[PDB]
Amino acid sequence: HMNPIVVVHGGGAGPISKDRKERVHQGMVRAATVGYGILREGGSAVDAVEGAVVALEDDPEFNAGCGSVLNTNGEVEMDASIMDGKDLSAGAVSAVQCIANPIKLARLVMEKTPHCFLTDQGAAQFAAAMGVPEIPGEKLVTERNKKRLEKEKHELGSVGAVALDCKGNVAYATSTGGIVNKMVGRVGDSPCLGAGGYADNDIGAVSTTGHGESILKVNLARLTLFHIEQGKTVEEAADLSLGYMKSRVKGLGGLIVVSKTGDWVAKWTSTSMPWAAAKDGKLHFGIDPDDTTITDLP
């Protein structure tokens, strides 16, 4: 049987201050631990990435769940998606408001409905009948996010995880608040199968982050896979696809990928992308290029 692995990422974004790097280090290791945990018990690729993403949704350092950036109206409107490489079963939501964990609801969409994509008010109604707790806006809002909003007015990207399990299934999960002063009801790549992620057992899985208009226009995650189906290393593929994204539509960001045969990589063309990976009891972490650290992980 396979050796399981989880890979996680934060924003493919600008350079991050070195106090915020510490809470970022700890948050990444956390999400990674919840996913590896579940795996190491022979659990599924789907639950692990869901585990991991959920831990970054509940952390206000990251641009997903609580700590989601604010739209034009200073409100949190969130996107998330999930996919299982075995059946290509999938679930997603756009523009959801007033809940803790948009990624759970994507998973609720994947397994309770014969659809794959619910948005704004219809997602919010599905939530009610699944009894998702509806909570006030402020509980997701951080004082940092109000400040940053007046900055781009008076003139931290997606989060995600990929996994391979001890059975050989892969999955991806993605979630985000979108972007600062985004138009109302703006939908990013994070809920667009192929763009914000893809998962196929006969290939591998990918979670992306960056400029989401760019990402959607090149189908960045499925493109990364196209390079692997042509038999490139995982490294090369990400580099062709990220490299295509730069040269064709002037777009920066990054992605994490795991192929069906065990290998995995975290690459980016933006400045920094927090990331972590947990395989064989070692944990791999980093933010800036060629700055990795390996630790041990129970």
Closer residue to its own copies (CB): 126 or 264: 126
Tell which residue, 56, 109, 64, 122, has the closest CA to residue 83.
109
Which two three-digit tokens encode residue 159?
A: 């989060």
Sheet strands side by side (includes 197-200): 197-200, 204-210, 253-259, 264-268
66 sits near Na ion (criterion: CB under 5 A): yes
Distances from the Cα of 187 to the Cα of 89, 94, 191, 282, angstroms = 21, 6, 8, 36
169 sits near its own copies (criterion: CB under 8 A): no
d(CA 71, CA 76): 7
158 sits near its own copies (criterion: CB under 8 A): no
206 sits near Na ion (criterion: CB under 5 A): no
Per-residue binder mask for its own copies (CB under 8 A), 59-88, x = binder? ------------------x---------xx
d(CA 279, CA 46): 17
d(CA 93, CA 110): 10
**8 and 32 in contact (C-beta within 8 Å)?**
yes
Closer residue to Na ion (CB): 189 or 200: 189
Tell which residue, 60, 22, 63, has the closest CA to residue 188.
63
Cβ at position 34, least distance to Na ion in Å: 14
Query: Residue 67 binds which entry of its own copies, Na ion, none, with Cβ cut-offs from 5 to 8 Å by kind?
Result: Na ion
173 sits near its own copies (criterion: CB under 8 A): no
> Hey, how many other C-beta atoms are within 10 angstroms of the C-beta on 244?
16
Query: Residue 187 binds which entry of Na ion, its own copies, none, with Cβ cut-offs from 5 to 8 Å by kind?
Result: its own copies
d(CA 211, CA 274): 16
The footprint of its own copies on this chain (CB under 8 A) covers a number of residues equal to 44
Which two three-digit tokens encode residue 34?
A: 């919840």
Query: Residue 95 binds which entry of Na ion, its own copies, none, with Cβ cut-offs from 5 to 8 Å by kind?
Result: its own copies
Per-residue binder mask for its own copies (CB under 8 A), 87-126, x = binder? xxxx-x-xx-----------------xxxxxxxxxxxxxx
Site residues for Na ion, window 26-65 (CB under 5 A)?
A: 59, 62, 64-65
Residues within the interface to its own copies (CB under 8 A): 77, 87-90, 92, 94-95, 113-126, 182-188, 192-195, 198, 212-213, 216-219, 222, 226, 248-249
